[PDB]
Amino acid sequence: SPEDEIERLERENEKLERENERLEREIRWLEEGQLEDKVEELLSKNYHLENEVERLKKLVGSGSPEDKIEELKRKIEKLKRENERLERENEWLERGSGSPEDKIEELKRKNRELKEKNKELKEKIYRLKESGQLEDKVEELLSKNYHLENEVERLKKLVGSPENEIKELEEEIRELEEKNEELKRKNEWLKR
């Protein structure tokens, strides 16, 4: 089915999109690097991020709400993708296949573009890394900087009251389940 194609290419492109962004940043740091200077300032940046992780960790008194919020955010993601799958089929049934096939065409063009750039970016980094020892240190420290960045934001999506948060997410789940049901009713109505 066309929507099986659409889903696949969106999955693959977003990952490419994310991975290319990281490579862009690495090259931007290694071309700009005076590399010893760049290393020092990455240490300080990672130092500041690790203390923020610690600060935010202490603002979390219990992991039990954290677990719950994480669980609800996952459920919300499941429900949204399923609602999107139902809306696409419903549009397709109502309005025909010309709209997916153009979307697919655009998605396969961007996919090829994204992969071409990925290969170029990755090729540039190997060249940039080259008989250099500082260069790997810079690689690791940027990688660490990426993970600490992600960790600070994870702890920011939590801390504000954790139970007010669970209250919100559970209301959103009610809305999505209501929407899911309407979309399935319209779908069965169409395929009758």
Author numbering: 2 to 34, 37 to 133, 135 to 163, 166 to 198
The authors write:
In the coiled-coil protein origami (CCPO) design strategy, CCs are used as modular building blocks to design protein nanostructures. The desired shape is defined through the topological arrangement of parallel and/or antiparallel CC dimers arranged into a precisely defined sequential order, based on the underlying mathematical rules. To address this issue, we sought to determine the crystal structure of the most elementary CCPO, the triangle. We designed a triangular protein using three orthogonal CC heterodimers concatenated in a single polypeptide chain.
We designed the variant TRI-4SHbGCN where P5:P6 is replaced by a GCN2 homodimer, and the segments are connected with GSG linkers. The asymmetric unit contains one TRI-4SHbGCN molecule with a triangular fold as designed. The triangle is nonequilateral with a shorter GCN2 side (34 Å) and two longer (47 Å) P1:P2 and P3:P4 sides. There is an internal cavity of about 600 Å2. The electron density is continuous for the entire chain, except for linker sequences, where only two linkers have clear density and could be modeled in the structure. These two linkers are attached to the P4 segment, suggesting this is a more rigid part of the structure, as also reflected in the lower average B-factor for P4. Interestingly, in the linker connecting P4 to P2 both Ser100 and Gly101 become part of the P2 helix and Ser100 side-chain hydrogen bonds to Trp95 on the preceding P4 segment. Therefore, the structures of CCs incorporated into the triangular fold remain essentially identical to the structures in isolation. An unexpected feature of the structure is the interactions between the CC segments at the vertices. A closer inspection of the TRI-4SHbGCN topology revealed that the chain forms a relatively shallow protein knot, known as the trefoil-type knot.
